[PDB]
Symmetry: C2
């Protein structure tokens, strides 16, 4: 809807940063829409991915990194706090040792840093969602 | 781009009908964009699917049907005529015994009818593409 999807924003991340995303899946869960959030090391979409977060709504979540062109060890989760047909609020916080992903205010996934978050230059949000809000916080030293 | 995605059109199919789709993937193949074409038995997206065609660009194609709410036996193919970064023309012809899928003029997949094509009432084209052309032919008795 309001924001264009695929959505790309230049970004910088460090401990204490938060990425906030508000959106809605474009299809009922029976049709298995996806959502993907990628933290890139360059503005180019083929660049490395420090944190890859892919939701198959109603089924599974996969997290990984792409380093020097190659996907590393996938982390797969069956935790599914997203609700069929509902708007969601997704929050990704940079902690000292990991990303923490909150879904509608509830801690739902974490992912230990494989690359320093300082390597991030770009965030992309895409696949089968509409987006009404995207924010990266920049309040900390 | 020009046509809205997800794209839905009421449709009727019988022997000799052709569905023509011209589009472009929204991402390079390294990021694994998808394309999905579904022939539905009702205008509602939760309705049964007589022919489901899902491309994971650069990797695989899965075809199936959803009958009374349940996915049946998947047909998986590694044939990949789609070209990274390129516009594609996709043609799906209804033959007496099967669907035949042409990609840029080349026969690439077929799928034997599990449900009569006359059961189709709607076609949906969605996932990670832009669409510039969609047509269903209606020339035959």
């Amino acid at each position: 809807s309001l924001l264009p999807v695929p959505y790309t924003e230049a970004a910088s991340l460090s401990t204490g940063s938060t990425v906030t995303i508000k959106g809605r899946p474009l299809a009922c869960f029976l049709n298995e829409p996806y959502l993907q959030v990628d933290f890139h090391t360059e503005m180019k979409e083929e660049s490395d991915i420090v944190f890859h977060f892919q939701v198959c709504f109603g089924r599974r979540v996969v997290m990984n990194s792409r380093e020097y062109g190659a996907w590393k060890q996938a982390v797969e989760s069956k935790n599914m706090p997203f609700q069929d047909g509902q708007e969601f609020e997704l929050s990704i916080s940079v902690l000292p040792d990991k990303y923490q992903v909150m879904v509608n205010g509830q801690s739902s996934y974490t992912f230990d840093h494989r690359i320093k978050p300082e390597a991030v230059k770009m965030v992309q949000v895409w696949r089968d969602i509409s987006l009404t809000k995207f924010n990266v916080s920049y309040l900390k030293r």
